[PDB]
Amino acid sequence: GRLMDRIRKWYYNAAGFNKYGLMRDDTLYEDDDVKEALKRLPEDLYNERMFRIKRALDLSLKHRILPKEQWVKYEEDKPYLEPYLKEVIRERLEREAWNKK
Amino acid sequence: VHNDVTVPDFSAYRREDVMDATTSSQTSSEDRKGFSYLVTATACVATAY
Amino acid sequence: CPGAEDLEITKLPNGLIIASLENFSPASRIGVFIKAGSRYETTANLGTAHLLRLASPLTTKGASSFRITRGIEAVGGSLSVYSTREKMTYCVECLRDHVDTVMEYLLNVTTAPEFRPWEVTDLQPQLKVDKAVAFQSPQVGVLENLHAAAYKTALANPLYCPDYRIGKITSEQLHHFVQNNFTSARMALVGIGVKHSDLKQVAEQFLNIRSGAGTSSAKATYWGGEIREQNGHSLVHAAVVTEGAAVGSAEANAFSVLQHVLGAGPLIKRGSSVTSKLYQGVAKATTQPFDASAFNVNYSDSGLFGFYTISQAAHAGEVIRAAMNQLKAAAQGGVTEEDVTKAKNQLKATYLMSVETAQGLLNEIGSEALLSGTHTAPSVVAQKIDSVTSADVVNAAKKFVSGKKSMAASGDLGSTPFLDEL
Amino acid sequence: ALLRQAYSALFRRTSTFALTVVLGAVLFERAFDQGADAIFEHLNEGKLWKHIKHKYEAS
Amino acid sequence: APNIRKSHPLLKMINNSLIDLPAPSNISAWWNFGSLLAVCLMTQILTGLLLAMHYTADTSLAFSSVAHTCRNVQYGWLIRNLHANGASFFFICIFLHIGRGLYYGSYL
Amino acid sequence: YKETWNTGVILLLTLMATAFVGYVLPWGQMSFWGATVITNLFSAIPYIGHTLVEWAWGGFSVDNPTLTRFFALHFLLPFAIAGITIIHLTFLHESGSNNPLGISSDSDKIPFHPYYSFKDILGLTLMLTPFLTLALFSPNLLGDPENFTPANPLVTPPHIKPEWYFLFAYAILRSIPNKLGGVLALAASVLILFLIPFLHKSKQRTMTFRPLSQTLFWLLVANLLILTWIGSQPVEHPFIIIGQMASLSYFTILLILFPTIGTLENKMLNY
Amino acid sequence: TYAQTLQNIPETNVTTLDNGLRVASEESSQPTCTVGVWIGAGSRYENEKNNGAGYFVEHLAFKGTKKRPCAAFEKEVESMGAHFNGYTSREQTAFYIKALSKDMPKVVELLADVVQNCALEESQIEKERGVILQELKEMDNDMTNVTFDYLHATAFQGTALARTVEGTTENIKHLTRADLASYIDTHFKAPRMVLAAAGGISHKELVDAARQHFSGVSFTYKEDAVPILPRCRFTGSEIRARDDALPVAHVALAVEGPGWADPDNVVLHVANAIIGRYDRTFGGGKHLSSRLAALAVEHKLCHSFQTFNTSYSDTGLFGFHFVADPLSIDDMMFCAQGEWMRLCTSTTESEVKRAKNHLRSAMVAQLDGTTPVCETIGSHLLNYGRRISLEEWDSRISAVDARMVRDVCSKYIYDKCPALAAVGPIEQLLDYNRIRSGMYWI
Ligand code: HEM
Ligand code: HEM
Ligand SMILES: CSC1=N[C@@](C)(c2ccccc2)C(=O)N1Nc1ccccc1
């Protein structure tokens, strides 16, 4: 049924990164794979990500959040980095596999 | 030009076994090194002691 | 226990030509010939062909950038791309037992490129480097200017991406180029050390970018300009040409012979070229080191003919004028009937040696199998060459002295004469 | 060919060079102590409790 | 960075002061006292701690705790000699270090 | 930030040794007996144990040579702490500080001065009030009255309990009724910290946006509260069982729940 | 298949004219062919007084003979569409011609006339004296070659291999018509030469024209005697030519190699194949199989680098050479020495497998045309005293494995004193001692 979907939507809202206007992908820890993926983002997607983050850090220092009407909605969260990230990890594993003789 | 350049003569310094230009220096290499390394290993022994 | 063999050559319905040959050599050398080049670029996408050439190792729909390089190296293979203003060749070499392996890559590269934006951005600074090493030979620089003075369009475009465009070429531009030029009817899949049934099979079952003649290139319009690059070098390189013959143009061989009659490169190490009208003539004029040769290029719809010199700055004047007289003098019957005999030897020899190396052979086969899906017998070619009268040659020589000329010179041009003083 | 043999077997590999320094120190110690201890006692014959002891020992 | 000796934040330091450090090819024995002084320092500290672990700072126990050290502590007497003379070694070296400096105008 | 973290764990261990050798100096009953209980822990190590202990003591029990060497150590260690702090901060500057959102702050940084110099001086005076209030109005609120009695080698206090900051660890030591097993449990209770970096499964750095991990985090904190409390009580029912529970859940939360929940959370985000 | 193609390659035929000369040739069906004479001579055979003679001769070997002066000689060769080239190295010299098989015989006559009756025109000599002096100034700007000369200059200091092929300025300014004459007579002798040809030629027809123009037979046993040269002592050392005015720096490091006849060379070549080579135009970039190459790309360690196994009769130079900016020398040298250690210590089966394939196609590529195949023949008989088929090489290459590579490399590289040559802005290259230490553990 819609159990998994129900759960995911609950968590999304429970997590709360959307109160800062951040997309799920804006919250990823920048390990090696993520760093490489970021470098592949198109100019505009990259500049938009940057603004959202700079803006959230501002909210964080002010100890405020966005007005409830600007919170990102679970179904409008754009997974802008996931596609790239997947390719990156896919490539890395290939190299890794291939370098094992 | 570089053609007019030659390595000076180091006979006043060469170890006895590599003094002769027409003799392979590889045959005395293990002795030349074994000796120097012996001194070192010995110092390590004295030091460890 | 292998022996002789045939030079087969099918030609599928879509127009894709397939020429193979089995010489039982332990090494195979397949290639994809294509009618593409800076010739098809326009002001808007200048240099896109150059970059496309360097883009061969980028990821494709079938292989990743990493696997293309690792895969080929895995079996001691190689992958390279040579190109002229009007043709591009993608070839791979490797030991016989690996033709399958190496094939997948050659295929992917020419028909399934992904031109990922990031990969492309990263590669563009290479154009500067590539171009930098190429330009170390003065030769390359004046030949660029030469074509820019010779034509107003198509063949006028440089073979190396102009500076203002390094970093500005886009992925869409690379895709559009490959889509409008790498069409089945402008490509030829030539192979050596392989079996036709095999090579033929690979083509039809794998080559998908489809048919058409794609975007056709504009006609080459002659200009007859003059470009002078004053850069202070002690030596002055200069080339003077005239519209010569086109590929296949009957008047071709005539120039080829007039070329060898005038002087087409040295034959003896550190030796003088006596059989060289042009060299010998220039030699008599100046005392200092120099070099003169008959320049000759044949393109699809045009060609260029003339002489290329290299000389000290102060003697550039006399050296170039001396080269001119040797051309007039030749235009005025000053061509022995024996000269034409010798030249026909050097020409038959040269052509024959050209095909000794795998690279030269594959290129011979492919080039023709591309511009006419056929193959002239080394006898018919010889037959066509020697059947060139001394008249023909003297005529070619005339067409030069009478036709409009274009010149290009670089170095300390302080004493280099202008085209209108020749 | 001791220097030669020594080099190949002991001094070439950095690992073997280390084991040689350990056993060397072990053997050296045993030998050096005993020798030095002798040289000292010899230069002092009859003066150490080692020498006098027997006179009053009576356990 | 391809080699750790240069990239690592700690090794980088050992490398820039004791391995890849550029030194004049012609410095004499008068340039040895710097490192000797450094070793005296490490030495004095080491023996000093060993002594401190048996010392007692009270006018009624000071003198005797030092005696207790030299008479009862295993190698106590040795450690005390090394510390006491080490101080002299330290001054010998500092005076030569200074002399070198004055002579060669290191004070510049 | 692994190197900063690891040197951080070394700093904790060094601070602890310092406090231990420092606490012995006044030589009251608690100083003596606690020093006896602790030093005797090392005798649990098989084979070399008894040997190391007597070595550390400089005799057959905590005595004068133990005191003078402890003074020297207490005098020295604070400086090792200062030195290692420099290393701590040196590794830290390779990356600069992390921040509450766990996302890069390169797009919004500010000079330490005057922002944090002022913020830090403020923090100093805020925490200085409780310190001084305690120090000047309740000097002995946190200390055992037993330490106002000169050490007596022949009389052991009825209730030997450690300083508040070592209680939780003590509770863990007692959870395992086996001498050597308790030592290991104690060792692990602190060395577990070296393992934390390898148990991170979240795709996000902080717990700010991870509600499940947050609950898990406070359970852990409360679990430490219970251990602290249990460590101040005598070994008797119900304490003994409550103690073992808390010890057990302490290691469980860190070794199993955190990484497990971390993975579970990644899936709820569709990663 | 591959194996089959190797077995079906026409055999190389050899015969000897009892005057001491050997005639070898591989037959194919090509209307074109290359034939030439490979002489076992070079700068190594010279000495302090006649150094650069063999080079001086290489300049006249084409300016005419006795039977036919300059113009005549040239015209005749040119007019038949044949190419006349040649070269002189330290232990080998060669003069060869490219032309139509239809002239194999006239060419053989031409070759013989060159090696036997060089005119040595007194006036031409003074003319070439000035030309050779101009080539020495041109070559002096070829850092790569200035660097390899220096590598030999120090690696074999005190011996013959220490001299450059072109010779000294003094020698070139004073070599006499008599000296060159003497040189030719002393060295260009039948037993020390090889008539090699490849293409569409009859071995018997070749050998015949050979008998006709290379006829002079020997009576004594000393006339069939090929003089064994005195050994050249290798010396671990360094020569540093510093000029911070040069844009990039060149560096070459090497250890003594075995020498032609040694089977180990098959392994050293496989080894060099693992390390490979690189230059800023290799499209492969950061994905290249060569670890050193990958690092070079990632860290921008150099403009280029190459490995090499230069053989000789009794010795050789096994090492590498790189060009880098003054500020990346140290890291490059570090990674380079690092890869050499990995060779002796941790080579993999996968690594050799690849290197073996790369090596096979490398050998096959050295037989791409008549001239290169002819060069193989001249060289093989002159160095192994016999032709070595691709099938044999392949047989040997196939036997190589990781273990073997480690053993052989450990043998020639591990803890050895190397020869170092550095030119240009080399202030960053650390001292000998530090480099010497890079020779062990890793
Ligand atoms: C710059 C290094 C040092 C110098 C120059 C130095 C010098 C001295 C001198 C002059 C003495 C007297 C020796 C005597 O009895 O005649 C002394 C005593 C002592 N020092 Fe140091 N010392 C140094 C470091 C230390 C340190 C770091 C400690 C301990 C942590 C220390 C602990 C002691 C102790 C305990 C004594 C008293 C016992 C004794 O006199 O033997 N010292 N030191
Ligand atoms: C004497 C003990 C210590 C001192 C003086 C000390 C000092 C500091 C300083 C000055 C900072 C920067 C400011 C801050 O973020 O608070 C810092 C950061 C840090 N320290 Fe410590 N520290 C100590 C112990 C520890 C311990 C015990 C740990 C962990 C086991 C630790 C982990 C860290 C880490 C990981 C940071 C990074 C902070 C961030 O997220 O940006 N420190 N420490
Ligand atoms: C010298 S006794 C001691 N040192 C303290 C300050 C300490 C111990 C361990 C680690 C750091 C600090 C402590 O609490 N005690 N007391 C005590 C009482 C009973 C049982 C154990 C310790």
PDB file of C-alpha atoms in Angstrom, chain C residues 3-11 17-24 29 33 188-197 199-200 351 355 360-370 372-379 381:
ATOM      1  CA  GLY C   3      49.668 -17.498 -48.162  1.00  0.00           C
ATOM      2  CA  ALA C   4      48.255 -14.814 -50.482  1.00  0.00           C
ATOM      3  CA  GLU C   5      44.917 -12.960 -50.263  1.00  0.00           C
ATOM      4  CA  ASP C   6      42.339 -10.580 -51.759  1.00  0.00           C
ATOM      5  CA  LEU C   7      41.502  -6.969 -50.968  1.00  0.00           C
ATOM      6  CA  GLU C   8      37.734  -7.350 -50.671  1.00  0.00           C
ATOM      7  CA  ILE C   9      35.448  -4.334 -50.298  1.00  0.00           C
ATOM      8  CA  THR C  10      31.686  -4.518 -49.667  1.00  0.00           C
ATOM      9  CA  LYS C  11      29.358  -1.481 -49.484  1.00  0.00           C
ATOM     10  CA  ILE C  17      31.933   1.162 -47.235  1.00  0.00           C
ATOM     11  CA  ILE C  18      33.834  -1.846 -45.865  1.00  0.00           C
ATOM     12  CA  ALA C  19      37.340  -2.564 -47.184  1.00  0.00           C
ATOM     13  CA  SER C  20      39.498  -5.284 -45.647  1.00  0.00           C
ATOM     14  CA  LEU C  21      42.715  -7.197 -46.417  1.00  0.00           C
ATOM     15  CA  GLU C  22      44.433 -10.207 -44.902  1.00  0.00           C
ATOM     16  CA  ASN C  23      48.234 -10.055 -45.034  1.00  0.00           C
ATOM     17  CA  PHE C  24      48.515 -12.538 -42.185  1.00  0.00           C
ATOM     18  CA  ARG C  29      45.114  -2.304 -37.739  1.00  0.00           C
ATOM     19  CA  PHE C  33      37.677   6.867 -42.076  1.00  0.00           C
ATOM     20  CA  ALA C 188      34.376   3.768 -44.258  1.00  0.00           C
ATOM     21  CA  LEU C 189      35.428   0.870 -42.028  1.00  0.00           C
ATOM     22  CA  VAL C 190      38.858  -0.199 -43.331  1.00  0.00           C
ATOM     23  CA  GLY C 191      40.914  -3.029 -41.818  1.00  0.00           C
ATOM     24  CA  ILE C 192      44.231  -4.889 -42.163  1.00  0.00           C
ATOM     25  CA  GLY C 193      45.222  -8.267 -40.767  1.00  0.00           C
ATOM     26  CA  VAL C 194      41.535  -9.149 -40.621  1.00  0.00           C
ATOM     27  CA  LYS C 195      38.978 -11.253 -42.518  1.00  0.00           C
ATOM     28  CA  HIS C 196      36.316  -9.419 -44.535  1.00  0.00           C
ATOM     29  CA  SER C 197      33.441 -11.585 -43.310  1.00  0.00           C
ATOM     30  CA  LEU C 199      35.009  -6.863 -40.289  1.00  0.00           C
ATOM     31  CA  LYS C 200      31.890  -6.762 -42.438  1.00  0.00           C
ATOM     32  CA  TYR C 351      54.189   6.040 -53.716  1.00  0.00           C
ATOM     33  CA  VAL C 355      52.756   1.655 -48.383  1.00  0.00           C
ATOM     34  CA  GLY C 360      50.694   4.015 -44.739  1.00  0.00           C
ATOM     35  CA  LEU C 361      49.005   0.979 -46.271  1.00  0.00           C
ATOM     36  CA  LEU C 362      45.803   1.255 -44.238  1.00  0.00           C
ATOM     37  CA  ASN C 363      45.705   4.924 -45.111  1.00  0.00           C
ATOM     38  CA  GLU C 364      46.089   4.231 -48.811  1.00  0.00           C
ATOM     39  CA  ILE C 365      43.302   1.668 -48.876  1.00  0.00           C
ATOM     40  CA  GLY C 366      40.935   3.696 -46.715  1.00  0.00           C
ATOM     41  CA  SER C 367      41.434   7.058 -48.446  1.00  0.00           C
ATOM     42  CA  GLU C 368      40.421   5.697 -51.819  1.00  0.00           C
ATOM     43  CA  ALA C 369      37.823   3.315 -50.411  1.00  0.00           C
ATOM     44  CA  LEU C 370      36.288   6.479 -48.976  1.00  0.00           C
ATOM     45  CA  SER C 372      35.020   6.226 -54.387  1.00  0.00           C
ATOM     46  CA  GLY C 373      34.461   2.867 -52.709  1.00  0.00           C
ATOM     47  CA  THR C 374      37.078   1.261 -54.979  1.00  0.00           C
ATOM     48  CA  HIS C 375      40.734   0.319 -55.229  1.00  0.00           C
ATOM     49  CA  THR C 376      43.105   1.171 -58.070  1.00  0.00           C
ATOM     50  CA  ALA C 377      45.756  -1.496 -58.733  1.00  0.00           C
ATOM     51  CA  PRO C 378      49.333  -0.335 -58.028  1.00  0.00           C
ATOM     52  CA  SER C 379      49.814  -0.900 -61.771  1.00  0.00           C
ATOM     53  CA  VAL C 381      48.246   4.066 -60.735  1.00  0.00           C
TER      54      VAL C 381
END
